[PDB]
């Protein structure tokens, strides 16, 4: 795995010693090269995970996420070039280093074999994210958003730390392989119930769950474009990955303890999508759509059926790409109009046609237009829930309807109607912005061709 | 104060602590504590100020009461055992009294009250000495008597220390008072594992010493005692305030910084002893410490407060004083988590 | 110089002599005090310090070449003369900058006295800068809060130093001051109001001269008397050294003072008291931009000796 | 309340200095090179070559192997009359049922 980790580390000295005119260029080049190298990990075995060493391993769950992170870094740099263009060289290098550190941490999280190592790194991801949000945010709510995000995540994580150490003391090892081979069923004792809660709540906080999702709107809206990209593309999937890993030692208590969270998420998807319907901020709308799409994954993980897990992995990858793209488009519009009010800018389709096409394709992916991987994951989760209970189809179909409604509503309000007259600073789309949108869309549509790669280890 | 005299007084404080850590006789340990107090009062009042005099008086009163109770406990143990060695105390009442006295010397709540006041009154150098070096001797005595320490009493004091430190730190604006309350909380963390594993207490003590050294030295380098005075630092020296941000995050304990090591190992040892509720509450309450650390980091470096016109003149001149240890202390207090297996060396 | 040197035996009192004396020449605007101060220094062998200017700190550091006003001072005396009631706060900002410059000057002078042993003659001092601020407040040029902040800054800084042994006051009447200013030719000086000069004179004679008289001798001289430098020097020589707190000081206190004056940042530590007055307060964006500009200046990016851009070499082994 | 610079005017459109901008930086040459780097590595390499690499990625999921083994097993099962799939994933002989 060091074939990916070591170059990622070597990015930092390069960025620090790169010329002020070559910082972005060098970073983008070598980040793309690192993504190319990470592509090799997709060759997962049929049964055994790719155990590179005692500390790092990968499976058909970890590899897509690793590729996603290594691919997301260059696009984040490209997006960050615009607003961080009047910054001093040292601070620009600092931002690049924060992004690189975040990518390195995420790689190690997705490859860590030891559960406590995963906890350490997955909670280490907070520091770069917090710094990015609080320092390079544009509004005054950035400080409160960072506080909310950090405190939510820590309040979830600390009981998880206690529980993990308890497991290490009792079982003797926290290695995923040993934990899976030496799995022992949990009883219904209150101690086991609280252990299950401690092991689940942290990941429930990580991937916004209705009731504990209050941090996400603030974080996504206040954070800079790159920060929002990671927040909505990988940092949320951290919760899903950790939950799928930790559910191995949380059975059969999951059957009894899932009902609260299952109902919370099944109603939360509807609630959040309805909230999207009546939103005035573009980034807030995108964030709430993310909340709903992640609630789908939460349901899938809780049900613990093989189809559910496959759909969960596919949905995670698809949502990462789509949400990052949506935030990038909103960022371009925001940079041009210097406001996040959705109704402020209207009829942008006339002024910017190609960006409007990008908007259309992104919204289509958001509403899970067949045969996009978004639809593949959503349909798999829907079928798994239908097997769990036939009544689920009601809420699932209603959520699909509301998602389509609010996505098309966003497209109509922004990229349709009479153009706003006073807004005269809408210049033609830059090549960089179009390239960013293309590098978000094309991989997803290509992934639809060979979904087996992103269908998880249960394929 | 003449520099030779000051060096002699500092060496006397160190010698008192060394005697406490070197002696095998209870009387000599008490003598070492008395020497520490005697040589500490003038150091606290090196810069003659009414606030400094008040701080010295309060410190003397508290430490004197602690020494009285300590000697009383020693005498009771002598009465019921005829022993002077620093071993298992053979009288429970003497054990309780000695625990109270040593906690008062440390500053564990509910004997925490004097710590913020004295810390605010004294200078940054005196504050550094008070919050780092003065914590060694009582902790050493506690470590030697850990077997006899009543777990219930010590755990109650430690948990209350953590809670009260967090709460007090939330309300403070003066940097010294924030540091003092954080010190109270960290001492609670240190003493929580004292009945279970002393080596973990030593580890936490060392990490705390490094972190507090780094923080106090950065404050001295920036010559700031309030949140706004520290806020002005970004204009002159951004490096100092950014490193302060890093150290504050470590003090909060957020991984992968050094501050995670002590909390991680403490939770490990407490869970090994079948205690799960206590460490969970400890971490959840340390979140408050993290909160006030984050507020300070916000004001210092994460955000930029307005500056003054006179800062331009200060820009031209460069700091003459050079604290040699500061870089190494910053490194050791930020990036040492990959080095936990070195815990064995402490044993 | 440090604690070690004092331990080694370096004692300031050994170097200090009867000649070693801080003499401050004060007066109203264009009183010719500078000429008399130079004459006193020459005829006493003391080191004369030219009156602290806006770019005094620029002279002390770097290459001595005055830096840009936007980068060093952000205040104009000429603007104050033209518009004394500007909405930019130039009046109080200028006064505070002048006080900081004079605080640095006094420290620079004391350091010279405690290292070389040679006496110092200074044109006014911190103990005298209050006169101009009081005059501005009387004229209504500055607001009361500015005066309050100036008092705050002074009380936390000036106390650490020792008042001058000799206070020479060149008493020139306001009409003669006006005549000289008209002869001077400077249009900004010509714009100076007579009431401002009268306020300066009143502040001097009613506050400064009595308070200094309590501390030490105040050799008040008329313009004609000041012309006779020999008499002025003689009178200073015949002043009892008992006047002033210096006879009450010793090697320990002198060591403290010498350590204080060496660290210029410590000297100016309280000049940036975190009181947010609109006149002095500089916004974060402007602060960052100006500091970045200052750092770009050659010789300011790195510590002295490590700025290769100026010609420093061997940095790899420095 | 504070002497601060007036809000910076709307970000200068990079088209203003150079009509051919491509975004990225301000220097036209570095803009050209940044666009070349992003397009070449981003589209020509990863998106094309890596897609081909993952397209012809050797089958280590044992899909074809599974199908071939299933074919062999079906042949044997039908030839010997054995049921195509048994009712026990493990032999009952080695299961010491309580």
């Amino acid at each position: 795995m060091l074939k990916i980790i070591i170059p990622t580390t070597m990015l930092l000295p390069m960025t620090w010693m790169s010329k002020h005119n070559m910082i972005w260029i060098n970073a983008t080049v070598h980040s793309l090269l690192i993504s190319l190298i990470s592509l090799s990990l997709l060759n997962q075995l049929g049964e055994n995970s790719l155990n590179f060493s005692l500390t790092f391993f990968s499976d058909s769950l970890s590899a897509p996420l690793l590729v996603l992170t290594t691919w997301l870094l260059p696009l984040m740099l490209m997006a960050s070039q615009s607003h961080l263009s009047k910054e001093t060289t040292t601070r620009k290098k600092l931002y690049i280093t924060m992004l690189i550190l975040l990518q390195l941490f995420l790689i190690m999280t997705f490859t860590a074999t030891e559960l406590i190592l995963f906890y350490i790194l997955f909670e280490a991801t907070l520091v770069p994210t917090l710094i990015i949000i609080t320092r390079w945010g544009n509004q005054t709510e950035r400080l409160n958003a960072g506080l909310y995000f950090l405190f939510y995540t820590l309040a979830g994580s600390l009981p998880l730390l206690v529980a993990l150490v308890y497991i290490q003391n009792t079982t003797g090892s926290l290695n995923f392989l040993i934990i899976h081979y030496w799995s022992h069923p949990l009883s219904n004792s209150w101690s086991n119930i609280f252990m299950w809660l401690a092991c689940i709540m942290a990941f429930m906080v990580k991937m916004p769950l209705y009731g504990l999702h209050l941090w996400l709107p603030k974080a996504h809206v206040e954070a800079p474009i790159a920060g929002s990209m990671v927040l909505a593309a990988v940092l949320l999937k951290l919760g899903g990955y950790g939950m799928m890993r930790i559910t191995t030692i949380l059975n059969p208590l999951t059957n009894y303890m899932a009902y609260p969270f299952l109902m919370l998420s099944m109603w939360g998807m509807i609630m959040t999508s309805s909230i999207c319907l009546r939103q005035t901020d573009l980034k807030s709308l995108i964030a709430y759509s993310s909340v709903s799409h992640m609630a789908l994954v939460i349901v899938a993980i809780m049900i613990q059926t093989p189809w559910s897990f496959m759909g969960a992995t596919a949905l995670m990858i698809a949502h990462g790409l789509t949400s990052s793209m949506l935030f990038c488009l909103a960022n371009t519009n925001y940079e041009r109009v210097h406001s996040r009010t959705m109704i402020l800018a209207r009829g942008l389709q006339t002024l910017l046609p190609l960006m409007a096409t990008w908007w259309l394709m992104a919204s289509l992916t958001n509403l899970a237009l067949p045969p996009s991987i978004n639809l593949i994951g959503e349909l798999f989760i829907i079928t798994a829930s239908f097997s769990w209970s036939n009544i689920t189809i009601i809420l699932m179909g209603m959520n699909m309807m509301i998602t389509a409604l609010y996505s098309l509503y966003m497209l109509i309000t922004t990229q349709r109607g009479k153009y706003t007259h006073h807004i005269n600073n809408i210049k033609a789309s830059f090549t960089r912005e179009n390239a960013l949108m293309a590098l978000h869309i094309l991989p997803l549509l290509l992934l639809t061709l060979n979904p087996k790669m992103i269908l998880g280890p249960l394929y | 104060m003449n520099p030779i005299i000051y060096t002699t007084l500092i060496m006397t404080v160190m010698s008192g602590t060394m005697l406490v850590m070197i002696s095998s006789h209870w009387l000599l340990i008490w003598i070492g504590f008395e020497m520490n107090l005697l040589a500490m009062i003038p150091v606290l009042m090196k810069n003659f100020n009414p606030r400094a005099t008040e701080a010295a008086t309060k410190y003397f009163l508290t430490q004197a009461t602690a020494s009285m109770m300590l000697m009383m406990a020693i005498i009771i143990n002598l009465l019921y055992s005829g022993q002077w060695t620093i071993t298992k105390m053979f009288n429970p009442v003497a054990m309780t009294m000695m625990t109270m006295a040593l906690a008062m010397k440390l500053g564990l709540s509910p004997f925490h009250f004097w710590v913020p006041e004295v810390t605010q009154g004294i200078s940054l150098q005196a504050g550094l000495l008070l919050l780092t070096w003065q914590k060694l001797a009582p902790l050493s005595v506690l470590c030697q008597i850990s077997q006899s320490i009543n777990p219930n009493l010590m755990l109650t004091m430690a948990m209350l220390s953590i809670l009260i430190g967090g709460w007090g730190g939330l309300n403070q604006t003066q940097l010294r008072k924030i540091m003092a309350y954080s010190s109270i909380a960290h001492m609670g963390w240190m003493t929580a594992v004292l009945p279970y594993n002393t080596t973990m207490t030593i580890l936490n003590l060392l990490i705390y010493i490094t972190m507090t050294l780094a923080m106090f030295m950065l404050l001295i380098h920036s010559s700031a005692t309030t949140t706004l005075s520290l806020s002005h630092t970004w204009n002159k020296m951004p490096v100092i305030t950014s490193l302060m941000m890093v150290t504050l995050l470590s003090m909060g304990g957020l991984p992968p910084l050094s501050g995670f090591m002590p909390k991680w190992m403490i939770i490990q040892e407490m869970t090994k002893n079948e205690s799960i509720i206590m460490p969970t509450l400890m971490a959840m309450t340390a979140l408050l410490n993290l909160y006030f650390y984050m507020r300070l980091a916000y004001s210092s470096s994460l955000t930029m407060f307005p500056s003054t016109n006179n800062m331009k003149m200060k820009w031209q001149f460069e700091h003459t004083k050079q604290m040699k240890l500061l870089p190494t202390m910053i490194v050791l207090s930020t990036l040492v988590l990959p080095m936990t297996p070195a815990l064995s060396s402490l044993n | 110089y440090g604690p070690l040197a004092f331990v080694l035996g370096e004692r300031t009192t050994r170097k200090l002599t009867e000649t070693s004396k801080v003499i401050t020449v004060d007066g109203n605007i264009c009183s010719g005090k500078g000429r008399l101060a130079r004459e006193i220094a020459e005829k006493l062998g003391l080191r004369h310090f030219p009156e602290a200017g806006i770019h005094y700190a620029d002279s002390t550091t770097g290459d001595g070449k005055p830096l840009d006003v936007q980068l060093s001072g952000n205040c104009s005396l000429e603007k104050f003369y033209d518009d004394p009631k500007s909405n930019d706060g130039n009046s109080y900002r200028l006064q505070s900058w002048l006080y900081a410059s004079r605080l640095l000057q006094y420290a620079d002078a004391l350091e010279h006295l405690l290292s070389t042993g040679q006496g110092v003659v200074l044109e006014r001092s911190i103990y005298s800068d209050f006169v101009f601020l009081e005059a501005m407040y009387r004229q209504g040029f500055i607001r009361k809060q500015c005066v309050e902040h100036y008092n705050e800054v002074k009380k936390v800084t000036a106390c650490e130093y020792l008042p001058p042994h000799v206070v020479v006051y060149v008493d020139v009447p306001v009409p003669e001051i006006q005549s000289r200013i008209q002869k001077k030719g400077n249009p900004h000086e010509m714009k100076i109001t007579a009431a401002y000069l009268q306020d300066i004179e009143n502040a001097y004679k009613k506050t400064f001269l009595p308070e200094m008289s309590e501390k030490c001798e105040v050799l008040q001289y008329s313009a004609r008397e000041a012309e006779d430098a020999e008499k002025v020097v003689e009178d200073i020589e015949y002043l009892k050294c008992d006047k002033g707190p210096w006879p009450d000081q010793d090697d320990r206190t002198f060591h403290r003072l010498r350590m204080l004056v060496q660290n210029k940042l410590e000297v100016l530590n309280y000049t940036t008291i975190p009181v947010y007055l609109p006149e002095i307060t500089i916004g974060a964006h402007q602060s960052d931009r100006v500091f970045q500009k200052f750092t770009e200046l050659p010789g300011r990016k790195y510590s002295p000796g490590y700025n290769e851009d100026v010609g420093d070499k061997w940095i790899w082994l420095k | 309340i504070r002497l601060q610079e007036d809000p910076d005017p709307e970000d200068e459109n990079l088209y203003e200095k150079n009509p051919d901008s491509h975004g990225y930086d301000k220097d036209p040459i570095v803009d050209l090179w940044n666009m070349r780097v992003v397009f070449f590595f981003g589209f020509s390499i990863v998106l094309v070559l890596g897609s081909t690499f993952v397209a012809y990625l050797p089958d280590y999921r044992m899909q074809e192997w599974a199908r071939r083994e299933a074919e062999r097993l079906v042949k044997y099962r039908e030839a010997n009359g054995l049921p195509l799939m048994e009712s026990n994933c493990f032999d009952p002989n080695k299961i010491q049922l309580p």
Binding site: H338 | S299, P306 | - | -
Partner: peptide, 14 residues
């Protein structure tokens, strides 16, 4: 077109 940076009022709360 500038990130919000604390004014005098924000610092005064501290």
């Amino acid at each position: 077109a500038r990130q919000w940076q604390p004014d005098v009022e924000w610092a005064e709360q501290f």
